[PDB]
Nucleic acid binder design. Structure first.
Lengths: 52, 85, 83
DNA sequence: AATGTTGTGTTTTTAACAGACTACATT
DNA sequence: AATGTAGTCTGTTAAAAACACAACATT
Protein backbone atom coordinates (compact mmCIF):
# COMPACT_ATOMS: atom_id res chain seq x y z
CA UNK A 1 0.00 0.00 0.00
CA UNK A 2 3.18 2.19 0.03
CA UNK A 3 4.24 3.79 -3.27
CA UNK A 4 7.34 5.71 -4.27
CA UNK A 5 7.28 9.44 -4.99
CA UNK A 6 7.44 8.61 -8.71
CA UNK A 7 4.39 6.33 -8.58
CA UNK A 8 2.28 8.46 -6.22
CA UNK A 9 2.85 11.53 -8.40
CA UNK A 10 1.52 9.71 -11.48
CA UNK A 11 -1.56 8.48 -9.60
CA UNK A 12 -2.54 12.07 -8.73
CA UNK A 13 -5.07 14.20 -10.60
CA UNK A 14 -2.43 16.60 -11.98
CA UNK A 15 1.08 15.11 -11.70
CA UNK A 16 3.78 17.75 -11.25
CA UNK A 17 7.56 17.72 -11.62
CA UNK A 18 9.58 15.37 -9.43
CA UNK A 19 11.61 18.28 -8.06
CA UNK A 20 8.41 20.06 -7.01
CA UNK A 21 6.86 17.04 -5.27
CA UNK A 22 10.13 16.54 -3.39
CA UNK A 23 9.90 20.16 -2.25
CA UNK A 24 6.33 19.43 -1.13
CA UNK A 25 7.67 16.61 1.05
CA UNK A 26 10.44 18.90 2.31
CA UNK A 27 7.81 21.53 3.14
CA UNK A 28 5.47 19.04 4.90
CA UNK A 29 2.68 19.87 2.44
CA UNK A 30 1.74 16.17 2.13
CA UNK A 31 -0.18 14.32 4.84
CA UNK A 32 0.45 11.68 5.98
CA UNK A 33 4.13 12.63 5.77
CA UNK A 34 6.14 9.90 4.05
CA UNK A 35 8.97 8.12 5.83
CA UNK A 36 12.35 7.81 4.11
CA UNK A 37 13.54 4.18 4.00
CA UNK A 38 17.05 4.50 2.63
CA UNK A 39 17.44 6.78 -0.37
CA UNK A 40 13.74 7.07 -1.27
CA UNK A 41 10.42 8.17 0.18
CA UNK A 42 7.49 5.79 0.64
CA UNK A 43 4.08 7.45 0.30
CA UNK A 44 0.82 6.03 1.57
CA UNK A 45 -1.91 5.33 -0.99
CA UNK A 46 -4.29 7.70 0.81
CA UNK A 47 -1.79 10.57 1.06
CA UNK A 48 -2.81 13.92 -0.41
CA UNK A 49 -1.42 17.47 -0.41
CA UNK A 50 -2.77 19.67 2.39
CA UNK A 51 -3.07 23.35 1.45
CA UNK A 52 -1.39 25.41 4.17
CA UNK B 1 4.81 -5.88 -34.69
CA UNK B 2 8.34 -4.70 -33.89
CA UNK B 3 8.52 -1.27 -32.34
CA UNK B 4 11.96 -0.19 -33.63
CA UNK B 5 12.48 -0.70 -37.37
CA UNK B 6 14.36 0.79 -40.32
CA UNK B 7 13.42 1.39 -43.95
CA UNK B 8 15.23 -0.71 -46.57
CA UNK B 9 11.35 -0.80 -49.35
CA UNK B 10 10.70 -3.14 -46.43
CA UNK B 11 10.68 -2.49 -42.68
CA UNK B 12 13.57 -4.48 -41.15
CA UNK B 13 13.90 -4.63 -37.36
CA UNK B 14 16.85 -2.85 -35.81
CA UNK B 15 18.08 -6.18 -34.44
CA UNK B 16 18.76 -7.20 -38.05
CA UNK B 17 20.84 -4.08 -38.70
CA UNK B 18 22.94 -4.93 -35.63
CA UNK B 19 23.31 -8.58 -36.62
CA UNK B 20 24.48 -7.58 -40.10
CA UNK B 21 26.86 -4.94 -38.72
CA UNK B 22 28.61 -7.51 -36.50
CA UNK B 23 28.82 -10.16 -39.22
CA UNK B 24 30.56 -7.45 -41.24
CA UNK B 25 32.70 -6.55 -38.22
CA UNK B 26 33.65 -10.20 -37.69
CA UNK B 27 34.58 -10.53 -41.38
CA UNK B 28 36.89 -7.50 -41.12
CA UNK B 29 38.62 -9.25 -38.20
CA UNK B 30 42.00 -10.14 -39.75
CA UNK B 31 42.88 -12.33 -36.79
CA UNK B 32 42.86 -9.41 -34.36
CA UNK B 33 41.85 -9.91 -30.72
CA UNK B 34 38.66 -8.19 -29.52
CA UNK B 35 38.72 -7.17 -25.85
CA UNK B 36 35.89 -4.61 -25.36
CA UNK B 37 33.33 -5.33 -28.07
CA UNK B 38 30.55 -4.38 -25.63
CA UNK B 39 31.75 -0.82 -25.05
CA UNK B 40 32.30 -0.50 -28.81
CA UNK B 41 28.75 -1.59 -29.71
CA UNK B 42 27.22 0.39 -26.83
CA UNK B 43 28.99 3.64 -27.74
CA UNK B 44 27.85 3.23 -31.36
CA UNK B 45 24.24 2.94 -30.14
CA UNK B 46 24.08 5.26 -27.08
CA UNK B 47 25.30 8.32 -28.99
CA UNK B 48 22.55 8.20 -31.67
CA UNK B 49 19.78 7.51 -29.14
CA UNK B 50 20.92 10.41 -26.95
CA UNK B 51 20.90 12.75 -29.96
CA UNK B 52 17.40 11.72 -31.02
CA UNK B 53 15.64 11.96 -27.63
CA UNK B 54 17.37 15.27 -26.88
CA UNK B 55 16.18 16.55 -30.27
CA UNK B 56 12.64 15.37 -29.52
CA UNK B 57 12.47 17.14 -26.14
CA UNK B 58 14.24 20.17 -27.68
CA UNK B 59 17.09 19.89 -25.21
CA UNK B 60 14.97 19.48 -22.07
CA UNK B 61 17.14 17.11 -20.04
CA UNK B 62 14.47 16.22 -17.47
CA UNK B 63 11.94 15.38 -20.19
CA UNK B 64 14.65 13.34 -21.95
CA UNK B 65 15.66 11.30 -18.90
CA UNK B 66 12.00 10.75 -18.00
CA UNK B 67 11.58 9.55 -21.59
CA UNK B 68 14.28 6.85 -21.43
CA UNK B 69 13.38 5.85 -17.87
CA UNK B 70 16.81 6.70 -16.45
CA UNK B 71 18.03 9.02 -13.71
CA UNK B 72 18.51 12.64 -14.74
CA UNK B 73 22.06 12.39 -13.39
CA UNK B 74 23.03 9.42 -15.54
CA UNK B 75 21.51 11.24 -18.50
CA UNK B 76 23.81 14.17 -17.73
CA UNK B 77 26.76 11.83 -17.15
CA UNK B 78 26.13 10.01 -20.43
CA UNK B 79 25.82 13.30 -22.29
CA UNK B 80 29.20 14.31 -20.87
CA UNK B 81 30.64 10.97 -22.03
CA UNK B 82 29.75 11.38 -25.71
CA UNK B 83 30.54 15.11 -25.45
CA UNK B 84 27.09 16.69 -25.88
CA UNK B 85 27.31 19.80 -23.69
CA UNK C 1 36.80 4.27 -40.88
CA UNK C 2 33.88 3.08 -38.74
CA UNK C 3 34.30 -0.36 -37.20
CA UNK C 4 30.59 -1.27 -37.21
CA UNK C 5 28.78 -0.75 -40.51
CA UNK C 6 25.82 -2.15 -42.44
CA UNK C 7 25.33 -2.53 -46.17
CA UNK C 8 27.00 1.70 -49.78
CA UNK C 9 28.49 1.16 -46.31
CA UNK C 10 26.49 3.08 -43.69
CA UNK C 11 27.51 3.13 -40.01
CA UNK C 12 25.33 1.44 -37.42
CA UNK C 13 24.64 4.80 -35.76
CA UNK C 14 22.75 5.79 -38.92
CA UNK C 15 20.54 2.69 -38.74
CA UNK C 16 19.70 3.55 -35.12
CA UNK C 17 19.03 7.19 -36.02
CA UNK C 18 16.53 6.24 -38.73
CA UNK C 19 14.81 3.73 -36.44
CA UNK C 20 14.05 6.36 -33.78
CA UNK C 21 12.85 8.93 -36.32
CA UNK C 22 10.47 6.20 -37.48
CA UNK C 23 9.56 5.47 -33.86
CA UNK C 24 8.80 9.08 -32.91
CA UNK C 25 6.49 9.48 -35.92
CA UNK C 26 4.46 6.36 -35.10
CA UNK C 27 3.79 7.62 -31.54
CA UNK C 28 0.14 8.71 -31.81
CA UNK C 29 0.16 10.67 -28.58
CA UNK C 30 1.51 7.78 -26.51
CA UNK C 31 3.80 8.63 -23.61
CA UNK C 32 7.29 7.13 -23.42
CA UNK C 33 8.78 6.03 -20.11
CA UNK C 34 11.32 3.26 -20.84
CA UNK C 35 12.96 4.08 -24.17
CA UNK C 36 16.49 3.14 -23.04
CA UNK C 37 15.74 -0.46 -22.02
CA UNK C 38 13.58 -0.81 -25.14
CA UNK C 39 16.58 0.07 -27.33
CA UNK C 40 19.20 -1.76 -25.25
CA UNK C 41 17.21 -5.00 -25.44
CA UNK C 42 16.95 -4.62 -29.23
CA UNK C 43 20.76 -4.37 -29.37
CA UNK C 44 21.89 -6.75 -26.58
CA UNK C 45 19.93 -9.70 -27.98
CA UNK C 46 21.73 -9.68 -31.38
CA UNK C 47 25.24 -8.88 -30.06
CA UNK C 48 25.01 -11.80 -27.64
CA UNK C 49 23.77 -13.95 -30.53
CA UNK C 50 26.87 -13.04 -32.53
CA UNK C 51 29.78 -13.51 -30.10
CA UNK C 52 28.18 -16.77 -28.95
CA UNK C 53 28.27 -18.05 -32.52
CA UNK C 54 31.78 -16.61 -32.83
CA UNK C 55 33.19 -18.33 -29.74
CA UNK C 56 30.96 -21.36 -30.45
CA UNK C 57 29.21 -21.37 -27.07
CA UNK C 58 32.39 -20.64 -25.08
CA UNK C 59 31.00 -18.31 -22.41
CA UNK C 60 34.45 -17.43 -21.04
CA UNK C 61 35.73 -16.48 -24.50
CA UNK C 62 32.59 -14.49 -25.34
CA UNK C 63 32.72 -12.55 -22.06
CA UNK C 64 36.38 -11.59 -22.47
CA UNK C 65 35.65 -10.61 -26.07
CA UNK C 66 33.15 -7.99 -24.87
CA UNK C 67 35.16 -6.79 -21.87
CA UNK C 68 32.55 -7.81 -19.29
CA UNK C 69 32.56 -10.16 -16.31
CA UNK C 70 31.74 -13.79 -17.03
CA UNK C 71 28.84 -13.62 -14.58
CA UNK C 72 27.56 -10.43 -16.21
CA UNK C 73 27.56 -12.34 -19.50
CA UNK C 74 25.75 -15.25 -17.83
CA UNK C 75 23.24 -12.83 -16.29
CA UNK C 76 22.46 -11.10 -19.60
CA UNK C 77 22.06 -14.48 -21.31
CA UNK C 78 19.52 -15.57 -18.68
CA UNK C 79 17.69 -12.27 -19.27
CA UNK C 80 17.07 -12.76 -22.99
CA UNK C 81 16.36 -16.48 -22.52
CA UNK C 82 19.55 -17.84 -24.09
CA UNK C 83 20.17 -20.73 -21.67
C1' DA D 1 47.04 -36.81 -18.39
C1' DA D 2 47.08 -32.22 -18.74
C1' DT D 3 44.40 -28.02 -19.30
C1' DG D 4 40.33 -25.15 -20.10
C1' DT D 5 35.21 -24.25 -18.91
C1' DT D 6 31.25 -24.44 -16.53
C1' DG D 7 28.40 -23.78 -12.53
C1' DT D 8 27.97 -21.15 -8.46
C1' DG D 9 29.19 -19.36 -4.62
C1' DT D 10 31.54 -15.52 -2.04
C1' DT D 11 33.40 -10.46 -1.35
C1' DT D 12 34.83 -6.27 -3.12
C1' DT D 13 34.11 -2.40 -6.34
C1' DT D 14 31.72 0.50 -9.71
C1' DA D 15 27.64 2.90 -11.42
C1' DA D 16 22.93 3.97 -10.96
C1' DC D 17 19.82 5.72 -8.00
C1' DA D 18 16.61 9.25 -5.13
C1' DG D 19 17.08 13.35 -3.19
C1' DA D 20 18.69 18.34 -1.53
C1' DC D 21 19.01 22.94 -2.93
C1' DT D 22 20.08 27.25 -5.37
C1' DA D 23 19.77 30.48 -9.14
C1' DC D 24 16.98 31.37 -12.91
C1' DA D 25 13.01 30.49 -16.22
C1' DT D 26 8.39 29.32 -17.29
C1' DT D 27 3.52 29.01 -16.25
C1' DA E 1 2.97 32.79 -6.44
C1' DA E 2 3.69 28.29 -7.87
C1' DT E 3 5.89 25.42 -10.68
C1' DG E 4 9.76 23.90 -14.01
C1' DT E 5 14.74 23.36 -15.16
C1' DA E 6 19.90 23.14 -15.05
C1' DG E 7 23.56 22.59 -12.43
C1' DT E 8 25.90 20.87 -8.39
C1' DC E 9 25.95 18.44 -4.56
C1' DT E 10 24.95 14.70 -1.09
C1' DG E 11 23.42 9.86 0.89
C1' DT E 12 21.97 4.85 -0.39
C1' DT E 13 22.08 0.63 -3.00
C1' DA E 14 22.00 -2.39 -6.97
C1' DA E 15 24.78 -3.87 -10.75
C1' DA E 16 29.16 -5.34 -11.94
C1' DA E 17 33.20 -6.70 -10.83
C1' DA E 18 37.07 -9.81 -8.92
C1' DC E 19 37.97 -14.33 -6.91
C1' DA E 20 37.60 -18.82 -5.55
C1' DC E 21 36.72 -23.68 -6.70
C1' DA E 22 34.93 -28.34 -7.21
C1' DA E 23 32.72 -30.22 -10.91
C1' DC E 24 32.69 -31.59 -15.87
C1' DA E 25 34.87 -30.81 -20.63
C1' DT E 26 38.07 -30.25 -23.96
C1' DT E 27 42.65 -30.67 -25.97
Amino acid sequence: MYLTLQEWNARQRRPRSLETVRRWVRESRIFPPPVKDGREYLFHESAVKVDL
Amino acid sequence: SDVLTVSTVTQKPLRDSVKQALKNYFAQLNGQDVNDLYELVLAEVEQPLLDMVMQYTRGNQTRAALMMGINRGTLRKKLKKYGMN
